[PDB]
Amino acid sequence: EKVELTLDPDTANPRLILSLDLKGVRLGERAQDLPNHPCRFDTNTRVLASCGFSSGRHHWEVEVGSKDGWAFGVARESVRRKGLTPFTPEEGVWALQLNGGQYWAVTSPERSPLSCGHLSRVRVALDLEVGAVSFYAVEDMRHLYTFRVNFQERVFPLFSVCSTGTYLRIWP
Amino acid sequence: EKVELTLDPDTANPRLILSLDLKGVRLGERAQDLPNHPCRFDTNTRVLASCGFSSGRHHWEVEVGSKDGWAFGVARESVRRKGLTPFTPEEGVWALQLNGGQYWAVTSPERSPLSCGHLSRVRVALDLEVGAVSFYAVEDMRHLYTFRVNFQERVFPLFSVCSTGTYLRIWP
């Protein structure tokens, strides 16, 4: 089921720059002076969508920048918000990443290089019955990667941008 | 006098993407579904700041993208909002522009090429006593261009982005 997502500004790392329509995210140079709510990521360059999922099957699409520094997928609600959090499935995030000109599934203890082509837009499919989060290149809906997870709590779309000069945008 | 400006989202052309903090603007691929206020530019890719000036001297700074398609400066309040408006001083806009890899003052009937070097951040100085809008490269505060105008109404900072892949941002 196609879901309409917006980014939740109360969760955003204060250095992120969200779009006014709450679909786009980049990294800024300077931390904004924002309320330091418990839900806000204070160190990792993350933001969640405002909608989380507890059951069923849902998908959404993400337009992705060509330059390094993004990662996106899903996170369990209980993901640590405060302090530098390892970027690993055990720490509650399941994500693809562009880093070093290369795409990765962010597995642990080593990340998993994908050898897909250039990515412009990616469909994320979450299946909470089967326990999967899957990524597809939209052009031909080619499968890129699936994490298999016995999700036991509410799961949120997750977006991260840790370098200037790239972006992610919930599409359309 | 240094002024703290924010973009006025009610004036923004619906294809523009404003930042949530109302300082940055880029052009999106698709028009958003926005309330068609009288103040909103419906055709030209323009947005005003929320603050207008009637007297005195004021300045602000604008971070600028390296790629073509931006223009910024000031507009008289009576600038036409509805329909395709010529981009000329006589139509109430006084601006610098990056187009064709070149910087221009948007004079009429012909634009005026500047021969400055690469611009990253530009200071706009508005002097309503003397009737001037001036542009400086911030690095060395080198004068780029001044328009002389007998302003007889409120003057608003003006920003325009007519190509994807570039941006402007009120700084810092």
DSSP structure string for chain B: -B----B-TTTS-TTEEEBTTS-EEEE-SS-------TTS-SSS-EEEBS--B-SSEEEEEEEE-SSS-EEEEEEETT---SS----SGGGTEEEEEEETTEEEE--SSS-EE------SEEEEEEETTTTEEEEEETTTTEEEEEEE----S-EEEEEEE-STT-EEEEE-
Asked whether residue B123 is domain-assigned, the answer is yes
The tokens of B71 are what? 């223009």
Asked whether residue A4 is domain-assigned, the answer is no
Asked whether residue B7 is domain-assigned, the answer is no
Asked whether residue A50 is domain-assigned, the answer is yes
Resolution (angstroms) stands at: 1.8
Contacts of A165 in chain B (CB under 8 A): none
SS3 A104: strand
Is cis: bond before B35, omega within 30 of 0? no
The tokens of B104 are what? 């221009």
In chain A the beta strands, taken as DSSP E runs, fall at 16-18, 24-27, 46-48, 57-64, 70-76, 93-99, 102-105, 112-113, 121-127, 132-137, 142-148, 155-161, 168-171
Which candidate in A7, A21, A25, A32 is best for mutational testing of the B interface (most B CBs within 10 A)?
Answer: A21
Provide the residue range defining the domain that includes B134. Answer: 16-171
CB contact (8 A) between residue B17 and residue A24: yes
Q: Name the structure determination technique.
A: X-ray
* C-alpha closest to that of B44 among B10, B98, B84, B94: B84
Rounded to 5 degrees, what are φ and ψ at B130?
Answer: -90, -25
Q: How many domains does chain B have?
A: 1
Asked whether residue B62 is domain-assigned, the answer is yes
Q: State the Cα–Cα distance between residues A88 and A79, nearest whole angstrom.
A: 10
Q: Which residues contact B46 (CB under 8 A, 6 or more apart)?
A: B11, B12, B13, B75, B158, B159, B160
Q: How far is CA A33 from CA B61, B91, B129, in A?
A: 20, 39, 35
Q: Which residues contact B91 (CB under 8 A, 6 or more apart)?
A: B79, B80, B85
Domain with residue B72: its CATH number is 2.60.120.920
